[PDB]
Structures are given as C-alpha cells and as structure tokens.
Design a protein around this ligand. Structure first.
Ligand SMILES: CC(C)=CCC/C(C)=C/CC/C(C)=C/[C@@H]1[C@@H](COP(=O)(O)OP(=O)(O)O)[C@]1(C)CC/C=C(\C)CCC=C(C)C
Ligand SMILES: [Mg+2]
Ligand SMILES: [Mg+2]
Length: 335
C-alpha cells in the first residue's frame, strides 16, 4: 500500500482535476507518481495566480519563488480564499512526495515551476494585446505544461528522447488546449472579471471585451469567435505530429484524450451564438464514445478530420475569416 502522504496526494488529484485524474492514474510505472505531483505543484501555483485577494506586489514574489518552496519542507500559504486552497495549506504533503521522486523528475518539475512563475508574474500588470502575446501567455500557462509532461515521458524512458526534445511540438499541444478553454469560457471569465481574448483581435469588433456579452452585439461576437477558433486550429498539424510519436499506450491515451476533447469543443463552439450566453459543452454520451475510440493514431486522425469537415461545412459565406479557416483545414486534411 502507498504511503499515507501519497494517498493524500491522489486524494487531492481526484478532488481538484475533473479532466486529468483518470488518465493520470492510468499511467504506467514511475510516470504515475511523477505526473500526479507535477499536476498538484502546478495546481497550487495556479491557485495563487488566480487569487485576486492577493495584491500584485505580494503575488509577484510568491510566483517567482514558488519553485524554491518545493525544497522548503514547511512552506505553506494560509491566506488563499480560493476553492482549491487545501493544496496550498497542506503544500508540505505535496512537497514531501515531490522530494520522494527520482531526481530526474524533480529537475523537470522544478524547472517548469520556475519558468511558469516568471511568466505568470509578467502578465499581472497587462492583458493580452497581440496574437503573438496570446501565444506567449498560453506558453506560460499551458505550453510549459506540455514541455514538462514531454520531458517527464522521456525521462521515464517509456518514450523516445525526441518527445522531450521537441519543445515546439509539445508547446503547441498546450496552446491548443489552452486557447480552446479560453475561447469556450468567454462568459464565465467575463463574469469573474477576467479577460483572456487578445485585445488586438476583439478591438476590431467592439470597444470593450464585455460588449460581446450584450445581445445586440452577437453578430460581431460570433465573427470574433470564428477568427479566434481559426487561430487555434493552426496548432493541429503539430498536435498530430506529437501524438504520432508516442509509443506507450497509457501515455498515448493521456495525451490524445484531452486533444480530441478540445477538437470536439472547438467544433461545437464554431459559429455558435451560445458561447456568448453560457458554457458550450460536448454531450456526455459523445465524450464517452471519444474516450473509447481515441486509443490509436488512425482513429485519432479520423476524429480530427470528422470535426474539421463539420466546421468546414458550417463556415458562413460572408465570414471574414472564411478563406483562412478553409486554408488551415485543408492543411490538416492533407498532412
Ligand atoms: C497528464 C495530463 C494529460 C495533464 C496533466 C496537466 C497538468 C500537469 C496540469 C497542471 C496545471 C493546470 C491545471 C493547467 C491547466 C489545464 C486546465 O484544463 P481543465 O480542463 O480545467 O483541467 P482540470 O479539470 O484539471 O481543471 C491547463 C489549461 C493546461 C493544459 C495543458 C496541458 C495539459 C499540456 C498538454 C500538452 C501535452 C500533453 C504535450
Ligand atoms: Mg485556475
Ligand atoms: Mg490561472
């Protein structure tokens, strides 16, 4: 039986992660613990970042120094008003299990914590302006998770060194998941005072981002939605390349499921007014079918092409992104 501290870590994983708990807990051998802890560490970091009761000036050191707290066995944070605060109040349990991991895993995890902290700190006194800056934000909060996971898979030796070495491909995997979430969660974020859509894009349509929540502005909102989805789709060639290299079945499933869930969510969101009224989600019955079929590369490719064709045939004649949307979809189909 596992140590009591590790049991506690898996308890926190199941409490806090809806999307990832199952796939993580199905990982083979040494990957399971490495990735459970990687998750919890980053989830604590995020809980700090998310917390708007922590002033910027106080938040900046906490984010910068977070990587170092992993080696301070009594470090915890008692001022969080976030839902996942337990992760911060009992951080010593998480950091004890982290220090129990092989050095080769510790190094990757701490390195990712350090870099994500710097990047999170950088976006505390600005929003996202350009599409380039959108890519940068997404790299800090998601791309680096992909790079982190990739390097862990390689360190365990269940996967070839190439998986951990190709940082662009791993970065794209994270970007695709993150843009999908940001696109889909427009309203939830607007209601909580958060703004993640790029300013240089939305500003061509409305004067304030929240203006897309107003019913009179729906035609413009959906145009902006379509332009941002088109942006996200450009990461799919790299997604296909990344998944095409994976050898371990448990690692294949962990990587592929969230990607095909995000592909399904993007297609559900395309040209969809409902994004501006509430949370658009793929039906649970369909989610089950995707989890079952996405176990090999050719079946993943089929799912991708299927959802691309769904989008393609829903492009409105007058959509200002239409030519771009067709172009990227073709690229995906022919690769
Ligand atoms: C092992 C496995 C699939 C995942 C474990 C992921 C770990 C360590 C996360 C710790 C930090 C977190 C929480 C980040 C945020 C995820 C929120 O989505 P959500 O749906 O709200 O999930 P949940 O229900 O938990 O809230 C996010 C946007 C990052 C997405 C980018 C990834 C995952 C890299 C993909 C790239 C490759 C796989 C190359
Ligand atoms: Mg968060
Ligand atoms: Mg956050």
């Amino acid at each position: 039986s596992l140590s009591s501290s590790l049991k506690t870590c898996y308890k926190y994983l199941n409490q806090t992660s809806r999307s990832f708990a199952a796939v993580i807990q199905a990982l083979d051998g040494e990957m399971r613990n490495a990735v459970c802890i990687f998750y919890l560490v980053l989830r604590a970091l995020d809980t700090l970042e998310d917390d708007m009761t922590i002033s910027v000036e106080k938040k900046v050191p906490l984010l910068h120094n977070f990587h170092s707290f992993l080696y301070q066995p009594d470090w915890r944070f008692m001022e969080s008003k976030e839902k996942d605060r337990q992760v911060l109040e009992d951080f010593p349990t998480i950091s004890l299990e982290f220090r129990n991991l092989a050095e080769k895993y510790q190094t990757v995890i701490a390195d990712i914590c350090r870099r994500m902290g710097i990047g999170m700190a950088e976006f505390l006194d600005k929003h996202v302006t350009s599409e380039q800056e959108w890519d940068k934000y997404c790299h800090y909060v998601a791309g680096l998770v992909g790079i982190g996971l990739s390097r862990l898979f390689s360190a365990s030796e269940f996967e070839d060194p190439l998986v951990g070495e190709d940082t662009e491909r791993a970065n794209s995997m994270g970007l695709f998941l993150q843009k999908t979430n940001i696109i889909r969660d427009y309203l939830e974020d607007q209601q909580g005072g958060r703004e993640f859509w790029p300013q240089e894009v939305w500003s061509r349509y409305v004067k304030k981002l929240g203006d897309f929540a107003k019913p009179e502005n729906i035609d413009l909102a959906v145009q902006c939605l379509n332009e941002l989805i088109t942006n996200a789709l450009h990461h799919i060639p790299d997604v296909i390349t990344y998944l095409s290299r994976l050898r371990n079945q448990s690692v294949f499933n962990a990587c592929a499921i969230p990607q095909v869930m995000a592909i399904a969510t993007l297609a559900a969101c395309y040209n969809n007014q409902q994004v501006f009224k509430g949370a658009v989600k793929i039906r649970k019955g369909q989610a089950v079918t995707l989890m079952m079929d996405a176990t090999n590369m050719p079946a993943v490719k089929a799912i991708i092409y299927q959802y691309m064709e769904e989008i393609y045939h829903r492009i409105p004649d007058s959509d200002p992104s239409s030519s771009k949307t067709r172009q990227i979809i073709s690229t995906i189909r022919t690769q």
